[PDB]
């Protein structure tokens, strides 16, 4: 329950399909849902069909039912679509402002952070959008650098000479001091104080 990211409006809705779960008010969250593939938004409880064994997450297919949210195939007779009238149902559904400027958010949310357009949009947008873009960029970087396994060293060699390998199909990580490895060595159970290293 906080201010919206793209609209600075009080909201309890986090876009579940996004990375950092940004706070979005009803209108702008609906715009993000209909203009991208981010068909999952969170609340005090996640927007998902609470009927057991169901796998729908799309807010468009999700309808408010009883004390929980359901889908057309699992809705009670008293059914209420979550995303309707240009806004997804939730708290502050009446005290809402919204913003017509939702194209930038929909573009930056689905970007892989591999094109210069993402950097241009991050440098040219609202301050809240710029901060969200920076946070998501850091999250993507740390998830791409953690998308591999544990580099295992099986032998010990002389000083300043180690044959470090990579994973199966993993590209070569930056050999410069751009990434400073800060792990935690495990003796038998606990991971603590591997030390500070700088690969060169």
């Amino acid at each position: 329950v906080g201010a919206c990211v793209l609209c600075n409006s009080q909201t309890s809705l986090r876009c579940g399909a996004c990375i950092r779960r940004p706070f979005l008010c009803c209108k702008c969250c609906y715009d993000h849902v209909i203009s991208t593939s981010h068909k999952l938004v969170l609340s005090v409880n996640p927007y998902v069909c609470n009927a057991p064994g169901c796998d729908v997450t799309d807010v468009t297919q999700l309808y408010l039912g009883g004390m929980s949210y359901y889908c057309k195939s699992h809705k009670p007779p008293i059914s209420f679509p979550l995303c309707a009238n240009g806004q997804v149902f939730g708290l502050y559904k009446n005290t809402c402002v919204g913003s017509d400027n939702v194209t930038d958010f929909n573009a930056i949310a689905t970007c892989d952070w591999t094109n210069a357009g993402d950097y241009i949009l991050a440098n040219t947008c609202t301050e809240r959008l710029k901060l969200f873009a920076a946070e998501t960029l850091k999250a993507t970087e740390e998830t791409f650098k953690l998308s591999y396994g544990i580099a295992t060293v099986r032998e010990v060699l002389s000083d300043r000479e180690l044959h470090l390998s990579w994973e199966v199909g993993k590209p070569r990580p930056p050999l410069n001091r751009n990434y400073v490895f800060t792990g935690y060595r495990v003796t038998k159970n606990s991971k603590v104080q591997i030390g500070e290293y700088t690969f060169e």
Binding site: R154, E155, H163, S165, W166, V168
Partner: protein, 193 residues
């Protein structure tokens, strides 16, 4: 069949009412595939290159080099064409890879162990004894060891880099799946044709 001759190295006295049945096991579901698809590596990776090389088998250095470029490989040779000691000489050419030996028969491991003790060290090699006639002078419960000898029937979960499966003719796809599920490695070596 030689009133049936038994090919056992031990002795036993039978009693009244004792019967022998063709006891089989329960085939568990097979998850692991036979082999992962191959891919051409640019460099010799996955195995640690050591600055000292073995000149004991000059006609196998090229074979080891070519194996180090392929994910899974198999050499087509007649029986006795270095079939029993190819992996043994590989474990000494590069003493930096977890070499795991396995066979489709428990009685065929004697041929493997005949010269392995002369070539590979005896002290640093051991065999896990489950709770049919093999060496018992080894050290049991040696989970962390460079060289591991065991059978698919009682093979616990472990990891390695190079796995050699001798006598590939008598092993079926189920046996291959069992070998790949009990032991998980990025390389698989098949000896035979």
């Amino acid at each position: 069949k030689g009133a049936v001759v038994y090919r056992g190295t031990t002795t036993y006295k039978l009693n009244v009412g004792d019967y022998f049945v063709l006891t089989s096991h329960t085939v568990m579901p097979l998850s692991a595939p036979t082999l992962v698809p191959q891919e051409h590596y640019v460099r010799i990776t996955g195995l640690y290159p050591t600055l000292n090389i073995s000149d004991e088998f000059s006609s196998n250095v090229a074979n080891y080099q070519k194996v180090g470029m392929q994910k899974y490989s198999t050499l087509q040779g007649p029986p006795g064409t270095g079939k029993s000691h190819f992996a043994i000489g590989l474990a000494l050419y590069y003493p930096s890879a977890r070499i795991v030996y396995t066979a489709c028969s428990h009685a065929a491991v004697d041929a493997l162990c005949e010269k392995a003790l002369k070539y590979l060290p005896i002290d640093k090699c051991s065999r896990i004894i489950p709770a049919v006639e093999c060496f018992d002078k080894f050290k049991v419960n040696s989970t962390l060891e460079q060289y591991v000898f065991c059978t698919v029937n009682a093979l616990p979960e472990t990891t390695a880099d190079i796995v050699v499966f001798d006598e590939i003719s008598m092993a079926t796809n189920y046996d291959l799946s069992v070998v790949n599920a009990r032991l998980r490695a990025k390389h698989y070596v098949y000896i035979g044709d």
